[PDB]
Amino acid sequence: MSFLTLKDVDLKDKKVLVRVDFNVPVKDGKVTSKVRIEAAIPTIQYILDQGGAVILMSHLGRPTEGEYDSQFSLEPVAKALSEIINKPVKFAKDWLDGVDVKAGEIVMCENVRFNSGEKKSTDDLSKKIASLGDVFVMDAFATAHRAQASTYGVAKYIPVACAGILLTNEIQALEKALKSPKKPMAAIVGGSKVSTKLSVLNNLLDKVEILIVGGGIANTFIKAEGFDVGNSLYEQDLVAEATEILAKAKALGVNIPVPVDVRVAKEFSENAQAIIKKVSDVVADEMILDIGPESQKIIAELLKSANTILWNGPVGVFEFDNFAEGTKALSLAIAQSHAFSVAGGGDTIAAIEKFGIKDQVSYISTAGGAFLEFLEGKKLPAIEILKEKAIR
Ligand SMILES: Nc1ncnc2c1ncn2[C@@H]1O[C@H](COP(=O)(O)OP(=O)(O)O)[C@@H](O)[C@H]1O
């Protein structure tokens, strides 16, 4: 609401520049997944119906700035879009000098990342991009955490800057979980290290009633509670930090359900056999690879009560069937909850696909760092410039 959306701007007979996420996997000049191209169809369709000309801008892969590289050209993506849309898509390689388009037509620019000044958002390149159209639309959330000429700089100099369909929905789903969640609110933070999720843990610790820690993160908390972890993956350096997190959670009346029991193994492979053990019975030679059935029950209880769920990780190495029970019971609890659920991160997405509960999750973010920076409570430069340019 703080920024303008597609419905708040005049798109009739205007050159409309759209920053999309067409960072799709390519193999031998052919797209192996069309998911992200299918996602931006409503945004493209809407502009076309309003009477404007669409100018698509995107990044692909990791090319070196200031150089052209055919293995990262958006040419196969332009052909892929024309197939899905059924509408002709002109591919512009000389788009910076000029772009020629007529209402009802779609034009695909060559990869932005080739241009000098893109990563640093140079005012030189930002003004050149802004001069190509009348309105700027930002539809690529996965890149909203980076200030770049085609995600941030163009919005400074273009006459009109707004947010597209995908970006408006992503910010709305995330803000419905973070800014003012219907209580109770439960967050699940799982991963290999407390260090990589510390900022997520400190930001959520203030906004939730339930904070479930999982995997390597949970193991560090098990060590903080005084229990022996043996050969389990944990960060010794952060034990003092996780000890403080448990103290602040106590003071703020947050339920951090540290596992009461675990599933331990003597080998890290898909052939190892689970041994259900109380947290206090972990031997030196053993490693915690999943939670126990008592810890699953505690989690299922707490998520049944919740009206908002924020899921960022598993509770076990679910890639191993013998250590998948914990993440299965967690996924099934989230599915049964009917709470507004927001999921993000690769393991969470793999857990959702493996346990086939994708429909039963209200929102699934496919963003990486952009999703994590938002969960950390940080300002996303692409979003902030749209807020400024929305003021009248
Ligand atoms: N008990 C555990 N011990 C070791 N590794 C685990 C355990 N539980 C889960 N993992 C694995 O650790 C990885 C989590 O790392 P991370 O990349 O931070 O997760 P994400 O970024 O998707 O939230 C996952 O691959 C997960 O399967």
First to last CA, the chain: 14
Token pair 């007979």 in the structure block, residue: 13
Mutate which of 188, 189, 192 for ligand 1 pocket (most atoms within 8 A of beta carbon) = 192
Experimental method: X-ray
Catalytic residue among 368, 369, 378, 379: 369
Query: Is the C-beta atom of 289 inside 6 A of ligand 1?
Result: yes
Q: How far is the CA of 294 from the centre of ligand 1 (A)?
A: 21
Tell me how far apart the alpha carbons of residues 302 and 308 are, in angstroms, rounded to a whole number: 11
Tell me, yes or no, whether 141 and 270 share the same domain: no
Residues 120 and 258 in one domain: no
Q: Are 295 and 326 in contact (CB under 8 A)?
A: yes
Closest ligand 1 atom number to CA of residue 347: 22
Is residue 214 part of the annotated active site? The answer reads: no
From ligand 1's centre to the CA of 140, what distance in Å?
A: 26
Spatial CA neighbour of 40 closest among 142, 176, 156, 172: 142
Phi, psi of 75 (to 5 degrees): -55, -50
Around 164, how many Cα atoms within 13 Å sit in the side-chain half-sphere? 29
Domain tally, the chain = 2
What span, in angstroms and rounded, lies between the C-alpha atoms of 341 and 173? 9
Q: Does residue 174 sit in the same domain as residue 134?
A: no
Structure tokens, 29 = 């000049």
CA of 360 to the centre of ligand 1 (A): 23
Catalytic residue among 14, 19, 36, 263: 36
H or E segment to which residue 44 belongs: helix 41-50
The pair phi, psi for residue 308, each rounded to 5°, is -135, 130
Whether 326 contacts 274, CB under 8 Å: no
Paired tokens of 389: 């340019």
Contact 337, 303 (CB under 8 A): yes
For residue 92, what are the β-bridge partners? 109
Q: How far is CA 109 from CA 77, 129, 363, in A?
A: 10, 11, 30
Our answer on whether the CB atom of 313 is closer than 6 Å to any ligand 1 atom is yes
The verdict on whether residue 277 carries a ligand-binding annotation is: no
Bridge partners of residue 312, in order along the sequence: 189
Q: What is the DSSP letter of 259?
A: -
Same domain, 103 and 244: no
Look up the CATH number of the domain holding residue 9. Answer: 3.40.50.1260
Amino acid 157 reads: Y
CB atoms closer than 10 angstroms to residue 289: 26
Tokens of 290: 């999943």
Considering the domain architecture, whether residues 185 and 41 belong to the same structural domain is answered as no
**What is the chain's percent helix, strand, coil content, to nearest 5?**
40, 20, 40
How many Å apart are CA 360 and CA 294, to the nearest integer?
24
Tell whether ligand 1 has an atom less than 6 A from the beta carbon of residue 344: no
| 56 three-class SS | strand
Are 72 and 197 members of one domain?
no
Which string of b and e fits 108-146 if b means at least 16 CB within 10 Å? bbbbbbbbebbbebbeebbebbbebbbbbbbbbbbbbbb
Cα 347 to ligand 1 centroid, rounded to whole Å:
7
Q: DSSP letters along 91-114, please?
A: EESSTTT-----TT-EEEEPPGGG
Look up residue 117 and give its amino acid: G
Residue 377 annotated to the active site:
no
Residue 197 assigned as binding residue: yes
CB atoms within 10 A of CB 334: 28
Do 257 and 285 belong to one domain?
yes
Residues 113 and 178 in one domain: no
Same domain, 15 and 147: yes
Residue 140 CA to residue 113 CA, distance in Å, equals 14
User: Alpha-carbon distance 166 to 41, whole Å?
Assistant: 10
Among the listed residues 346, 356, 378, 379, the single catalytic one is 346
CA–CA gap between residue 221 and residue 224 (Å, rounded): 5
Residues 311 and 224 in one domain: yes
Same structural domain, 350 and 392: no
Q: Is 345 in the pocket of ligand 1 (CB under 6 A)?
A: yes
Probe ligand 1: pick from 213, 220, 317, 365, max atoms within 8 Å of CB? 317
Whether 66 is catalytic: no
Taking the centre of ligand 1 as the mean of its atom positions, its distance from the CA of residue 78, in whole angstroms, is 36
Nearest ligand 1 atom to the CA of 288 is 1
Domain that holds residue 120: 1-164+379-392
Decide: 347 in ligand 1 pocket, CB within 6 A: yes
User: 289 CA distance to ligand 1 centroid (A)?
Assistant: 10
| CB 166, CB 291: distance < 8 Å | no
304 lies in the same domain as 196: yes
To the question of whether residue 123 is assigned a binding role by annotation, the answer is no
> Do residues 289 and 317 lie in contact, with contact meaning Cβ atoms separated by under 8 Å?
yes
Determine the atom of ligand 1 nearest the C-alpha atom of 318: 27
Cα 346 to ligand 1 centroid, rounded to whole Å:
10
CB-ligand 1 contact for 111 (6 Å cutoff)? no
Copy the structure tokens of residue 57: 């801008």
Please name the residue ranges forming H helices in 267-324: 293-305
